Amino acid sequence: EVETFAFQAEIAQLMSLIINTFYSNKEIFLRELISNSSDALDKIRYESLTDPSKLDSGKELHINLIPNKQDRTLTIVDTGIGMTKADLINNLGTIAKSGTKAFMEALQAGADISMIGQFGVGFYSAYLVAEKVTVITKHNDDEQYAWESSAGGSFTVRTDTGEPMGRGTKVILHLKEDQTEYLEERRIKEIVKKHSQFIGYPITLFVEK
């Protein structure tokens, strides 16, 4: 069964700003999500140095980019540390609160939306291009969960009984109608090369059938 939660006030305010501000340089969403995946991969890689069994749920450390024109979705998959239920409901939003406040202050003082990563809240940049985001995640210490949000101030969390992923996170971006450029192989390649050139894990761009 699905549980529905309110976003913290400042996160809801940040998401409305992201959705409502006129800002053409939308492509930076992809950099932010790849950077989040790389950080999650660093985390499990470090933990495995002291406890090799943390990789029993999958030794490969990588990022896949999976466009689907038919469903109008771009999926970013990583085999990083993953997130617990408590992360999804409480921790991620709590940790993001100070960064959100700082970022919104910087935007009033002349910063632009592309600088969002410097405040550590880059995940929310997904709403530059997606009308709905689904996050499927599995941490070694918890069950597999699905977080989901179309913004408007709330998000849901439920257990995920779909195909078991082993460990990591899958972000499914349900793209806005006018943002289908981010499903084109040429465009994704261009963006990865521009902004994500030096990420230290293989990034595989899947091709469509």
Ligand SMILES: Oc1cc(O)cc(Oc2ccc(Cl)c(Cl)c2)c1
């Ligand atoms: O794009 C990614 C990739 C990853 O491995 C982890 C990740 O973390 C977050 C951060 C904030 C929120 Cl709200 C959520 Cl749902 C998930 C984001």
